Amino acid sequence: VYRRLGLGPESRIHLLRNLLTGLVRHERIEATWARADEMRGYAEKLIDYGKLGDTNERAMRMADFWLTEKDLIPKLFKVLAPRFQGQNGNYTRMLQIPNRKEQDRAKMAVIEYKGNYLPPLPLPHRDSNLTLLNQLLLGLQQDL
Amino acid sequence: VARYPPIVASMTADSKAARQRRVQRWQATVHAAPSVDEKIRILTKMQFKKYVVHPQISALNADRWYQSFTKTVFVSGLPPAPSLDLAALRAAVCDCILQEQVYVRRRRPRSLFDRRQALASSILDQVVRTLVNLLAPLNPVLSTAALDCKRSVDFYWLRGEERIPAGHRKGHIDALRYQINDKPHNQIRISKQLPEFVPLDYSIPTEIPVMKCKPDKLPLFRRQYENSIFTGSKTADPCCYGHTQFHLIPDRLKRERLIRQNQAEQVEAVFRANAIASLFAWTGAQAMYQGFWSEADVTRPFVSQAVITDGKYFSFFCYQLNTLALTVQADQNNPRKNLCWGSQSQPLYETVEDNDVKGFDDGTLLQIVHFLLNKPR
RNA sequence: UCUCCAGGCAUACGCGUAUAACAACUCGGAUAACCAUUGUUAGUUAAUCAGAAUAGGCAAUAAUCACACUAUAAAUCACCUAUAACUUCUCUGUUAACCCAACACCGGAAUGCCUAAAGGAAAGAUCCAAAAAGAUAAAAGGAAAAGAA
RNA sequence: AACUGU
Numbered sequence: 019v020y021r022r023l024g025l026g027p028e029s030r031i032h033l034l035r036n037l038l039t040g041l042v043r044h045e046r047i048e049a050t051w052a053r054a055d056e057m058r059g060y061a062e063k064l065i066d067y068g069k070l071g072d073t074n075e076r077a078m079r080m081a082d083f084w085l086t087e088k089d090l091i092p093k094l095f096k097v098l099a100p101r102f103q104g105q106n107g108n109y110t111r112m113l114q115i116p117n118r119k120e121q122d123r124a125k126m127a128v129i130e131y132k133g134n135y136l137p138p139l140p141l142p143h144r145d146s147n148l149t150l151l152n153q154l155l156l157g158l159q160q161d162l
Numbered sequence: 163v164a165r166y167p168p169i170v171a172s173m174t175a176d177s178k179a180a181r182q183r184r185v186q187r188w189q190a191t192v193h194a195a196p197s198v199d200e201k202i203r204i205l206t207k208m209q210f211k212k213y214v215v216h217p218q219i220s221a222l223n224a225d226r227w228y229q230s231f232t233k234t235v236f237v238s239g240l241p242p243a244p245s246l247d248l249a250a251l252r253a254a255v256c257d258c259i260l261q262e263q264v265y266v267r268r269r270r271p272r273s274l275f276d277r278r279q280a281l282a283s284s285i286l287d288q289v290v291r292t293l294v295n296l297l298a299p300l301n302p303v304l305s306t307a308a309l310d311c312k313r314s315v316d317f318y319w320l321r322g323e324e325r326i327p328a329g330h331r332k333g334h335i336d337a338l339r340y341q342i343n344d345k346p347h348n349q350i351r352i353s354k355q356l357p358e359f360v361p362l363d364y365s366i367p368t369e370i371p372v373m374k375c376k377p378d379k380l381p382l383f384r385r386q387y388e389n390s391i392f393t394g395s396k397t398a399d400p401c402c403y404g405h406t407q408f409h410l411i412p413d414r415l416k417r418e419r420l421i422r423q424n425q426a427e428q429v430e431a432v433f434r435a436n437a438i439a440s441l442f443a444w445t446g447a448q449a450m451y452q453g454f455w456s457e458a459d460v461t462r463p464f465v466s467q468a469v470i471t472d473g474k475y476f477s478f479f480c481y482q483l484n485t486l487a488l489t490v491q492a493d494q495n496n497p498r499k500n501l502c503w504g505s506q507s508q509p510l511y512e513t514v515e516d517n518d519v520k521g522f523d524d525g526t527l528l529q530i531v532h533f534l535l536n537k538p539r
Numbered sequence: 540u541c542u543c544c545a546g547g548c549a550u551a552c553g554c555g556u557a558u559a560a561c562a563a564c565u566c567g568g569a570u571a572a573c574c575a576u577u578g579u580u581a582g583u584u585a586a587u588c589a590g591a592a593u594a595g596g597c598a599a600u601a602a603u604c605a606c607a608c609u610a611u612a613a614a615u616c617a618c619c620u621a622u623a624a625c626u627u628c629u630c631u632g633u634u635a636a637c638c639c640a641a642c643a644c645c646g647g648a649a650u651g652c653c654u655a656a657a658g659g660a661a662a663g664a665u666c667c668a669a670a671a672a673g674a675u676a677a678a679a680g681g682a683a684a685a686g687a688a
Numbered sequence: 689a690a691c692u693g694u
Binding site for chain 1: 543663
């Protein structure tokens with residue numbers, strides 16, 4: 019249930035720790051698809067710790083350990099946590115990007131923090147209902 | 163009740179801020195060193211390639227370059243401010259050794275060139291010895307003073323930084339290291355600090371020299387060896403302060419040769435460069451003996467005076483040390499600066515024919531007498 | 540900026556432009572990025588650092604903090620007397636990530652200082668095959684711990 | 689003898 023990355027399990031935590039810290043600072047990070055999926059679960063769980071409250075000692079310990087840069091700790095409790103108070107989940111959005119042209123052709127994906135101020139990503143749009151097929155289905159819906 | 167940790171760089175990271183944090187940890191340990199000797203050892207335990215500074219140098223504007231490395235401002239003239247028969251001292255100063263150079267028989271030097279230079283050393287040593295005894299009754303400080311003959315004074319200070327241009331360490335930041343080694347002809351060491359010639363933090367509109375080119379462009383070479391800070395004697399010696407310093411210029415730098423070499427204007431520069439280098443290094447060592455270092459600037463101004471002679475002309479210089487923080491980090495925010503006061507070289511006599519001296523100038527001796535009579539208040 | 544590793548700096552020797560900047564992307568790096576490659580131009584500043592007269596006369600007693608103190612492996616020109624000369628700073632060394640091993644070889648390589656303030660990066664990407672190698676853990680049991688001869 | 693995946 020866990021990918022093998024880095025030179026060891028501790029390196030994976032440190033690698034995951036670095037990735038989590040980078041995401042918070044920028045809110046949008048591009049990395050290999052396998053690594054991005056691995057870090058997605060941790061990011062969502064951290065927001066739950068932020069929602070728990072700043073005064074929570076466990077959250078403070080967790081926030082301090084995971085976020086190397088301490089200026090982010092106020093941001094989590096005063097920017098990230100307040101923003102997603104309404105939402106119950108799905109805080110992180112991960113999308114596929116064309117593979118890197120670095121001679122290794124690794125699978126590339128982009129993971130972003132939802133609600134950010136960054137420019138909107140070019141997300142896919144479903145087919146419009148004005149299409150012939152959709153219109154026919156709409157007629158069936160109306161009859162029913 | 164949020165216990166936010168300090169917003170500081172990680173200690174273990176490979177970065178400028180992380181390196182600075184590691185540097186601070188070491189500097190904190192230096193602040194935690196109880197003994198002054200331990201402070202010196204820690205600062206000098208590691209040897210690195212550093213500029214070698216010669217108190218007497220023929221480089222053009224060497225005094226200006228030295229001032230930039232030292233952060234010293236040189237104001238022209240003397241610093242701001244018991245009868246003994248001045249006429250008696252005009253002769254009690256021992257024209258007798260000028261009489262003895264014609265009487266005292268000694269084996270002729272083989273070189274035949276050191277004869278002139280050897281003569282100057284003999285007279286100066288004899289004159290210094292007699293003058294200390296003659297002036298002792300008037301000034302009790304001279305009685306408790308310590309006289310040093312041709313002993314070495316060393317100081318090691320850092321000012322500025324440079325970027326490595328090439329090599330395996332290309333681009334790395336390193337401080338500019340300087341070392342001054344001097345052997346004054348004579349110097350007087352006392353157990354009590356001299357009276358200040360001006361209050362600490364004194365400010366004047368004149369600006370310290372600024373050097374456009376690198377130190378290496380002016381003839382100067384770096385070498386890696388032991389870093390030494392010396393007052394002329396070890397810390398165990400009770401006389402951790404001093405009264406006056408005496409210097410003798412070599413024949414190569416004398417006026418006659420310099421005028422022939424076209425560097426007539428540099429005669430004063432040689433006087434200034436030796437005075438500033440000798441006094442600053444000597445004064446800096448005294449403060450370190452008191453426990454004041456770059457991160458602990460002196461709370462009291464350190465003052466000293468020195469006399470430089472070419473064998474006939476005599477010059478008087480006074481130095482006050484106000485700042486021990488000369489590193490880029492330690493001198494990042496320092497308003498204090500070092501101040502040096504110097505006077506033009508003046509003849510002490512004209513010639514010595516027959517068995518007496520003609521043309522002796524008491525005015526230069528009066529400055530020596532006036533200087534010697536000064537004592538702390 | 541972060542994570543982690545912990546022989547670094549000078550000289551000797553050797554090497555001899557591999558140094559630095561620009562411009563190239565063909566060849567060299569056992570792949571790229573980038574250059575250590577290709578072309579062109581530049582470079583290392585010393586009275587202080589380093590290298591480059593003669594004839595006589597006369598000497599018992601180590602060092603070891605040298606005092607005591609012993610010992611055995613037995614352990615330091617000078618200065619006098621004469622002769623000769625009579626005013627001087629040129630020349631040369633100074634670059635580098637560098638040498639000896641056919642190689643950008645997991646090898647060899649003196650001295651001084653210091654032990655991180657200096658100096659560095661195990662991860663081309665993915666998968667988690669078998670088999671094999673190394674490391675770590677063992678219920679009960681102990682040849683089916685450091686104790687004796 | 690002990691010790692241990694011998």
